[PDB]
From a paper:
We present here a cryogenic electron microscopy (cryo-EM) structure of the IFI16PYD filament at 3.3 Å, which shows a helical architecture distinct from inflammasome PYD filaments. After extensive optimization, we identified conditions that allow recombinant IFI16PYD to auto-assemble into filaments. The average power spectrum from cryo-EM images of 256-pixel-long nonoverlapping filament segments showed that the IFI16PYD filament is a three-start helix with 134.6° rotation and 5.6 Å rise, displaying no rotational symmetry. Our structure shows that the assembly is mediated by the six interfaces that are commonly found in PYDs and CARDs (Types 1-3 ref.). The Type 1a:1b interface is composed of polar and hydrophobic residues, and Type 2a:2b and Type 3a:3b interfaces include mostly polar and ionic side-chain interactions as predicted previously. Notably, unlike the inflammasome filaments assembled by ASCPYD and its interacting partners, such as AIM2PYD, the IFI16PYD filament lacks the C3 symmetry and displays vastly different helical parameters. Moreover, instead of the six protomers that constitute the filament base of ASCPYD, the base of the IFI16PYD filament is composed of five protomers (i.e., hexagon vs. skewed pentagon). As a consequence, the diameters of both outer and inner rims of the IFI16PYD filament are smaller than those of the ASCPYD filament. For instance, compared to ASCPYD, the short helix 3 that mediates the Type 3 interface protrudes from the center of the protein by ~ 6 Å in IFI16PYD (dotted red circle in Fig. 2Dc). In addition, the loop between helices 5 and 6 in the Type 2 interface also extends from the core by ~ 5 Å due to Pro73 that shortens the helix 5 and lengthens the helix 6 (dotted red circle in Fig. 2Dc). These differences in IFI16PYD would then clash with the ASCPYD-like assembly in the Type 3 and Type 2 interfaces, also causing the Type 1 interface to misalign (red arrow).
Interferon-inducible protein 16 (IFI16) is a member of absent-in-melanoma-2 (AIM2)-like receptors (ALRs), which contain a PYD and one or two nucleic acid-binding HIN200 domains (hematopoietic interferon-inducible nuclear antigen with 200 a.a.). IFI16 acts as a versatile innate immune sensor that detects dysregulated nucleic acids, with its most prominent mechanism of action being assembling filaments on unchromatinized double-stranded (ds)DNA. Upon assembly, IFI16 mediates a wide range of innate immune responses such as accentuating cGAS-STING-dependent interferon signaling pathways, viral replication restriction (e.g., herpes simplex viruses, cytomegalovirus, and human papilloma virus), and even chromatin dynamics regulation during DNA damage responses.
Author numbering:
A (entry chain R), B (entry chain N), C (entry chain J), D (entry chain D), E (entry chain H), F (entry chain P), ...: 4 to 89
Write the structure that this text describes.
């Protein structure tokens, strides 16, 4: 149920600019070309995360990204709490 | 008559974005491959839920999914009320 | 003459998507297997309803199905008026 | 001569889908069992209508059937004109 | 010679379905019971026409039937041409 | 005179399929072997029924057979009318 | 020797269906009643042909009949060749 | 009288598709070769079943077949009722 | 004894369609005219095989025909086994 | 007495088609020419079998022929029972 | 032998759609009227082609037809190989 | 050989959507009523065009139809080239 | 030839959104029910126009509809030119 | 023709944001659930307006809504002029 | 009784798409040519499997086919249970 | 068993867009005309692959196609694993 | 194999906005009407390039288009490298 | 090729505000309503301009507009150079 956390409590609590920043930061880690960089959305990004990051469905890397963003530090802590719960 | 709740008062009220959300979230619990991710519509998704979630026709898991969606919290409460009525 | 209403003023007025909805929702009430889900058309479905719903030829159950569909509320009212007439 | 109109200008102008639908709608009025619904063609259906509807060879009930069919409304009017002619 | 036209250029140019339809339409005009409806072939039907339609051996009524058959309109014209030839 | 009804207005009105059907259904009641069931025509069948069914010359059992055959229900009614006439 | 062509190379080559065609078409030309049309075989038909058609033993009319039969056009040509030989 | 039911109420009430399926499913129990599989009709199939299933004229096995046929479950129940009547 | 195989295990096991192919493909080898092509039945055809194929009563050519028919390949193998037995 | 079984319980129980089968298959064993093939009836065939098959009056070979006929296997068993009876 | 290729490896390998296409394309070359287009099966069609195309029993024209059908190009090549073999 | 081009390089190369468009556009020129519009396939449509457009078997009119279709301009040019070749 | 203009130069040039607009605006003038709005494609919509708008096959009303759509003003002018030509 | 004004001169002159505002303001008056808020386009909205606002096809309420929006006051005046014209 | 499971509980439950899948996948294992792929229905396919897969009447290979189909996994499990029962 | 992999683990896991890509890229390698582009489904496409790519049943070319599609890289690896297994 | 480059390394790497730009720029060189401007996706557009730009399947013109797009200069260089490779 | 210059070297280089001023200044010359003021992007604007400014695809008036903008004077000179080149 790691995809539930990364999709509901993750990419869908942050705004569009932060989602674009997350996509750009994980473009190399998900092999996102030009089309996927601007066309893919939160559902498709989470599905690709699960497909390529089966260990934790990309929750760890999402938390690491959210740590560096000052606006999303609280959300990173919440995601850490969710991961500890599950 | 649970599938009449998950299909009429459930997947149909939600827009296409939230339906894709649900399909992605329930992909592991419904064994949806790449084709079923984008091809199956609400009728076939509800039928597959009834086939694989015979205990509650997927209504409980749909309500749990809708709880974490800020937009569909009211719909989750309505589905809870419908389930209690049935 | 109840099958006349449920066929010509019923399934024949709704599109293929709503017809698939009706076939799925009445699957338990008509014992439709996988083949009947994707092969039976409006004529066969109406005949099967009349066979298994001899009390009202499935017109009433179709009416409750159409009530929950926001698009077919007017058709549900029309079917109610037709049932009252006959 | 009524059977000439109900066959040549009737069942033989409408397609197979409408022919099956007519056969279903007249199953109770013609006592068609499972074999007759899926086996009888337009010739034998017209003959049975003439046998069991000697008043008008089934032309009138065919016209009332065609009235509710939006596609065959023009053919219903043509059948009315033919009946008025004869 | 009129029986030559109705049997050679007539009932034997049309297929079995059209021959059955002709037999059904002329059932009242030839007093065909159940047996003769599906047992008499083209030879016996033409003989019965000549027996009961001695004015024209049924050629006129066969042409009238063929006129309403869109598939056999050309054959109706050919039969008319042959009749005016003889 | 019951032979006249059962032959002229009976077996001679039904087609070959229904005659073979009657022969099969009356095989036990007429002790028809392999040769008789396949080779005997309507005349010999009526004569044998008169010989073995002297109470009503087989008219009652033929009517009972014709009752259950939907194509021959009208002929069964006609045979009943003939029986009450005679 | 005209009987040999019309019989051995004529009616004895066509099947029973085409022979019944020939018997029916020449019923007026041979004065064949109900029994003669349905009982006479090819030998007696050829004998009656010679009896009533002394000019050519019925070969010319048989060829004319075979001309209009599409299946027997080759046989008609063969009969023409035999007549030219004789 | 068991054959009197399996023919009127059985193989003839079902369509040709179901009759062929019945013939295939009873091929081993009736020793039907290649010819008899698609040459034997309902009358001959019923006669063969009565010959080889003298205990119940094949009514029990026909009911067992009809049961697993979703379309013919009602006919199976009717056959059970008729057997109990006999 | 070879006629016992070509008839009982040969033409009498195949249906009417396969028998018509057999009669057809052997028209040149059996000098079958228009009449014999659709009049001769299995007994007469087998007798003609024995008359004109004294070497093996036509069993070899029948097996060769059955080889190219995919439906009757098993029957061809059975005929080969019977020939090796005798 | 063996002639009684082969005639009364034998050839006279099978139909004309199977009788022609028997005549053709026994043509070599009975020296049946062209005339005897389609002129000798069951009485004459049984008499010739008794004249030529004095060991068992042809009962054994008739049973062997009936074994290969799927329709007459039951009659072959009956003839075997009669032979062991006598 | 050219019939063997055109029938067993020819019209009988293609489905009913392609067979109707062939009958249609050969209607002018075989003089098939309205009846023969919708009634003639593969046996009678092949016999007619041999009768009218004695040079190669219509194998060349069938191969030319099959060339233009993309689905039957492999079958056309196989027929060419068979023709070169024979 | 004009029907060969219109059926092979014509209607068979275009998809079902374009075939339905062609059938609709030629409905007035072919007198296609309601049944033929949704029932006739490419083989029967080509035969009807040849019957009613004997000057060019409908190839020219098909070319003019294909000219206005942007997808089938290349096929229209190919059909023009084929017509110039023949 | 007005339907050739309204279809090829009309509905087939506009995209799906404008086609749905044409269907919706002409719903009252064509009596399109709920099914017909979401099911009928350009071929069937044009055929229905020609059936119900025999004066100009619906070209005038299509042009009037296209006038108010800013995107399709050029197509409206082109259709006006086509109508003036025809 | 009120649907023509509300669609072509109405929702299609306003941009996407104003259309969303119109949909949100008429959510209660049209019973639009969450799916219809974000999925229904101008064609579907106009059709629903005609279905539920048959008095003026929603033109009056659309004009009232446009009055409150300063950007669309000119469009509201134009729609008033169009309503006065029709 | 293995053919009972593979037919009634097997191919008759799947829709036409999955049946075509089964026919294509078993083409090499059943030697189905071009005609057999597009013409055989469930009855004749089941008969062919029983003929060629005598070890398990094709039930095992059908189960392995149904395993890889995500839609028919439940049907594969049901067929496994049926095989274990028998 | 290569066609099993290319169908069940190949085209049946990818959606309609990827399947249209597949058919498109291999149009030259499969000689798919305009009809085959939009009509052939996965079963017919896989059958044509096996017919024209007997070396690997089209599995290898499908793998090279899936390699270039970023969404189907995992499925390409799975197909490579399946090929290595078989 | 140039369609593979223009489709996989080309139009599918670019986002939807750049694909619309490419469709616009190649509209004159591909004769794209109003429908194809907004309806044709990447598969259809690449196929149209192959049909109309057989020299290089439109790869050269696509590269020229990508040169003027600052975002897609790297993709233009990659396409040049692919063309040099193939 | 004037559209390539106006779209790539023109509207694609200027930012959003300059493009909005270009759309506002060209609104009268392009007949853009309220929706087209904001919704239309550079691709659609360039298309429209080609449609209505066929003399130079809008390059001349775009250059004239860019002349008055001090920021885009260099781009205006570059567009003049491109026009002179082409």
């Amino acid at each position: 149920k790691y995809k539930n956390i990364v999709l509901l409590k993750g990419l869908e609590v942050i705004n569009d600019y932060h989602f674009r920043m997350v996509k750009s930061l994980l473009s190399n880690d998900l092999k996102l070309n030009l089309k996927m960089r601007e066309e893919y959305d939160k559902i498709q990004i989470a599905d690709l995360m699960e497909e390529k990051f089966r260990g934790d469905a990309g929750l760890g890397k999402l938390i690491k990204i959210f740590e560096d963003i000052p606006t999303l530090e609280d959300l990173a802590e919440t995601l850490k709490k969710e991961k500890l719960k599950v």
